[PDB]
């Protein structure tokens, strides 16, 4: 009969992206999945090009990057794209996770935990990529952060030294981070394949939170056009940065070569890790700060069990909605705090923001679910 439905390869693509029954009513918040895919492809291409020109020796590395920006043809636009690209990826990631929380998409457990892993994996990737230029921030950032694994009792010191491949972040660390940074996106692609595979078992959630089988529509052309529109908007955004403001989201110390003898005035990681930096910095004790940092991320994995509401989505849950936006604003605050030096009043703002964060996820929004239930006579 029809090739799109039969052929072993075309069937999959058809089932996945053409004839897939999508809900009628998914919002712009469902754009982010496709956009994340784009982010991922974007990084791989721009990445691949950069890697045809870059070197991972301590001595050559900083200059090889600037060489891309001065002497390689269009090397500049490629490089700034891959860097703003990384920001756009984390925006897409945090938007995507947002939708998960608000609309109760995390009920799709397998899909969700894969997703947590995607997040961790992209985090590792971007952490190691930022080291690759070998700027002041790159170097001192990578040093402080990797050192946290020293706080692991018994094995900490040994473990951090084995990661490094020596006694500090040095030649061997950079060369291995280059390697890891290259192969990780590949593994992200597969995990993402799987991420989708599980999603395709249930089909999508929607903003009502109510099953939508009585009103599905073929993906193509409704959602083909709509994803494209979204991708345009992503490109609009990406290029606004690259072409008007390429350095807006970065730190200038990363234009100053890495120098093991002179520590920068304020050490920060990239903005997309600032909320977690600020949680870590709130705890006096170093292993405490480590376990808090890890929990600020891994808690994502627990949120499924903390669901109390009889309704899936927050659409009809006013009290929960307020708390959700509280969490969002708190994360904006945690980010602000994490970009700030450890002084009054920020030390105390940070401590509070850190408390608020865990308080919301583990106690307040569970409760609210339940209060709402009673307000509805169930």
């Amino acid at each position: 009969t029809n090739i799109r439905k039969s052929h072993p390869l075309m069937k999959i693509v058809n089932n996945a992206f053409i004839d897939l029954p999508a809900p009628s009513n998914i919002s712009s918040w469902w754009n982010f999945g496709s956009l994340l895919g784009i982010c991922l492809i974007l990084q791989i291409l721009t990445g691949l090009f950069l890697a045809m020109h870059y070197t991972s020796d301590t001595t050559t590395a900083f200059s090889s990057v600037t060489h891309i920006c001065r002497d390689v043809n269009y090397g500049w636009i490629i490089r700034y794209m891959h860097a703003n690209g990384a920001s756009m990826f984390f925006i897409c990631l945090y938007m995507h996770v947002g939708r998960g929380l608000y609309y109760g998409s995390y009920t799709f457990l397998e899909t969700w935990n894969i997703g947590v892993i995607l997040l961790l994996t992209v985090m590792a990737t971007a952490f190691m990529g930022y080291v690759l230029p070998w700027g002041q921030m790159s170097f001192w950032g990578a040093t402080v952060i990797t050192n946290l694994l020293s706080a692991i009792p018994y094995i900490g010191t040994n473990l951090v030294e084995w990661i490094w491949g020596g006694f500090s972040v040095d030649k061997a660390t950079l060369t291995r981070f280059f390697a890891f940074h290259f192969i990780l996106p590949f593994i992200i692609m597969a995990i993402a394949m799987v991420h989708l595979l599980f999603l395709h078992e249930t089909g999508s959630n929607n903003p009502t939170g109510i099953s939508s089988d009585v009103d599905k529509i073929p993906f193509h052309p409704y959602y083909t056009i709509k994803d494209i529109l979204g991708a345009l908007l992503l490109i609009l955004a990406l290029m606004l940065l690259v072409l008007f403001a390429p350095d807006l989201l970065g730190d200038p110390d990363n234009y100053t070569p890495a120098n093991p003898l002179n520590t920068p005035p304020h050490i920060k990681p990239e903005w997309y890790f600032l909320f977690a930096y600020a949680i870590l910095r709130s705890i006096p004790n170093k292993l405490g700060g480590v376990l808090a940092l890890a929990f600020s991320i891994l808690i994502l994995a627990l949120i499924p069990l903390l669901h109390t509401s009889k309704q899936r989505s927050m659409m009809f849950r006013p009290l929960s909605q307020c708390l959700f936006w509280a969490l969002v604003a708190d994360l904006l605050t945690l980010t602000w705090i994490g970009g700030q030096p450890v002084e009054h009043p920020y030390i105390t703002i940070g401590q509070l923001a850190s408390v608020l964060y865990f308080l919301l996820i583990l106690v307040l929004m569970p409760t609210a679910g339940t209060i709402e239930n009673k307000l509805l006579k169930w």
Partner: protein, 120 residues
């Protein structure tokens, strides 16, 4: 069957498309012969013929001799079938009605994209 609606629609539109773009001489000869037989054999006995007279005068304002019909059919060829079918079918918007377990009945947009071919 509740599960064949899409497949059915696809093959059917494919037929319209094929006739618009690529109808063969031979199959047109066949279509001619079908319609020839249809017209002759329908007008058989007093009632069908009485109706033909009656309706014809209302619709064409006269009765059309069988021999006239035949010379208009003889006119039709591959090119004519292609050309005419394109006028009415190729890249035009259909009207659609379904009743029953029509859960699988192609979305209107998909139906409309089926009224042309990217290859032509």
């Amino acid at each position: 069957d509740h599960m064949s609606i899409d497949d059915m629609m696809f093959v059917l539109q494919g037929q319209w498309m094929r006739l618009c773009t690529s109808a063969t001489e031979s199959e047109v000869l066949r279509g001619k012969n079908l319609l020839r037989n249809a017209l002759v054999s329908h007008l058989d006995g007093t009632t069908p013929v009485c109706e033909d007279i009656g309706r014809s005068l209302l619709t064409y304002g006269r009765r059309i001799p069988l021999a006239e019909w035949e010379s208009r059919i003889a006119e039709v060829d591959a090119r004519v079938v292609r050309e005419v079918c394109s006028k009415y079918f190729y890249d035009q918007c259909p009207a659609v009605a379904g009743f029953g377990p029509i859960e699988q009945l192609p979305d209107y947009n998909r139906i409309r994209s089926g009224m042309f071919w990217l290859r032509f």
